[PDB]
Amino acid sequence: LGSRTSLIPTLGNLSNIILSILGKPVQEASAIVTNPASEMGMAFTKVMNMFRMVKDIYTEESFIYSSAIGMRTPSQRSTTRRANLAIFLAAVYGALQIGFFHLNENFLEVFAPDESNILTNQGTLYMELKTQAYISAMAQAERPKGDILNDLFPSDMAHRFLIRRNAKLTYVEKQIIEKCTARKERLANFSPQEALNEVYPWGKFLSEIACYIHNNYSSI
Amino acid sequence: GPLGSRTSLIPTLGNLSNIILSILGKPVQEASAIVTNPASEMGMAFTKVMNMFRMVKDIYTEESFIYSSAIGMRTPSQRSTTRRANLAIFLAAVYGALQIGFFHLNENFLEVFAPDESNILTNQGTLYMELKTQAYISAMAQAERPKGDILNDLFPSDMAHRFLIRRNAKLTYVEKQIIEKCTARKERLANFSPQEALNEVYPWGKFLSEIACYIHNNY
């Protein structure tokens, strides 16, 4: 498709700006998003408005799936990978409205795309994301904790790892499964449940994810 | 500049400019249909590009065109990007994709087509005369102003001073040729009946094709 082909430089430029704004120290990035009338806040708002428009050209869902839209060249795929990181970081800072269910479902495609090797720090980030999804889902008083936890920390994690790389399990993969199992149990047996956000504060997760996305992808 | 400011967005400005130059780079009837039928598949897609271009353009200018010296775009690639963006603003304007009056188009023509005090070329002066011609034809349709007021504005007497002032200055042989081609075109327009046959004497689609062809070969 022509417009998706021709707009790759814009997709890339806006994604890079978002990543380098929202990858700053958490206090600095949070300030930018929560003060739209500041100098940098106003500039971020215009960048985000253009980004929302360009993103809609590439996907009607939460993230961009390069294979699904025929984006096949090395530069096209590298750009959509950057875009997906910018989307994820903007979602977690609230600049985009993407629910925790979609963040969890797409986490490996965003941080370990193209059947790459899953790394230990990705696994740790995965576990903390699932923990925040659980804490947020509990706050809606919609479904019981058991149901939430079985979705977020599922029994088929090993088959999912094999499927995603066309495969038995690697050492990191089995460590993640074991770390996730332990976190599920701690979460289910914790009391009082309403205290979990003090135990796993959001600000700490924000700092975890920005540092990863910064210190694993080049900024500016 | 700072993150997310005018220097940060230069690749987006150039990319959207290049897209507008490519799409309105098509044959006149094709390009015109894209703009005039916003419901077609191409028309719908072009609309989304133009909405993005409108937003990025506002970041670079409050007016019709982008003056790099006015907003501090100092690096060579930055200055070349604003120059190209100006060509795309002008191409979009004559196709109806952007709403910029003939007055703004006339006033910014040399800055758009001959920036940086380059010596005017006879071809640039030709198209300048053709643009003034079309701006007159349109101004006489609207018929809010007397014929002399309109010919004054578009074919003015101080055309000599303007060419001199433009390059910090006596005219070049080419520049005095343009003024005489201009004055003669004015006399013909000041004395043409029916005044609404001028649309047939100089067809708009001919001008459009001349501008587009010029831009398509000089951007």
Curated annotation (Swiss-Prot), chain A:
Domain of life: Eukaryota
Phylogenetic lineage: Eukaryota, Fungi, Dikarya, Ascomycota, Taphrinomycotina
Disruption phenotype: Cells arrest in interphase and have an aberrant chromatin structure.
Function: Binds the telomeric double-stranded TTACAGG repeat and regulates telomere length.
Subunit structure: Homodimer.
Localization annotation: Nucleus
Protein name: Telomeric DNA-binding factor trf1
Organism the protein comes from: Schizosaccharomyces pombe (strain 972 / ATCC 24843) (Fission yeast)
Swiss-Prot record, chain B:
Name of the protein in its database record: Telomeric DNA-binding factor trf1
Lineage, broadest ranks: Eukaryota, Fungi, Dikarya, Ascomycota, Taphrinomycotina
Positions spanned in the full protein: 98 to 315 of 485
Role of this protein: Binds the telomeric double-stranded TTACAGG repeat and regulates telomere length.
Subunit structure: Homodimer.
Species the sequence originates in: Schizosaccharomyces pombe (strain 972 / ATCC 24843)
UniProt-annotated location(s): Nucleus
The encoding gene: trf1
Phenotype reported upon loss of the gene: Cells arrest in interphase and have an aberrant chromatin structure.
